[PDB]
Design a binder for this molecule. Structure first.
Ligand SMILES: Cc1cnc(C)cn1
Ligand SMILES: [Cl-]
Ligand SMILES: [Cl-]
Length: 152
């Protein structure tokens, strides 16, 4: 992948986990991307999240690890992630693994360059989730949730 080409503004579209509580309201991973800045050794993210009904910002920096294509970041424990698929100018799919207290879960995210994506791309992401043991009932379409768009 040419990671420089993922730079810029993105929107969170679909959000999925094999630990559903983490992506429900008040879950730590119910976060909405605004941008990804590509740096030499890292990716800098800005997110929003809802806390007690109010939009709030989260800024994270993910560092390259010793494994090609993998990044790590501390947020509600220790996370690693990789990019599964992208065409740079419409969609990107991430796969992240969280560790906390020696337990783990997966998070998968579909971001778009616009506030929504078509049904074809969504469907393909759902199948990719299933390929990781993330069942359809654990995939949330954030376009029908509060994504703090007004806060962007
Ligand atoms: C919290 C978080 C979620 N997703 C990515 C890709 C990075 N950080
Ligand atoms: Cl809480
Ligand atoms: Cl919204």
């Amino acid at each position: 992948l040419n990671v420089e080409k993922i730079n810029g503004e993105w929107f969170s579209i679909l959000l999925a986990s094999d630990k559903r509580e983490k992506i429900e309201e008040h879950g730590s991973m119910r976060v909405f991307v605004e941008h990804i800045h590509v740096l030499e050794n890292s990716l800098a993210f800005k997110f929003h999240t809802v806390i007690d009904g109010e939009c709030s910002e989260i800024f994270l920096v993910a560092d390259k690890t010793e494994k090609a294509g993998e990044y790590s970041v501390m947020y509600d424990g220790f996370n690693t992630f990789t990019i599964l698929k992208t065409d740079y100018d419409n969609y990107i799919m991430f796969h992240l693994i969280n560790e906390k207290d020696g337990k783990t879960f997966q998070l998968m995210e579909l971001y778009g360059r616009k506030a929504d994506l078509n049904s074809d791309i969504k469907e393909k992401f759902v199948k990719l989730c299933e390929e990781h043991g993330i069942i359809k009932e654990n995939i949330i379409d954030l376009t029908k949730t509060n994504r703090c768009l007004k806060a962007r």
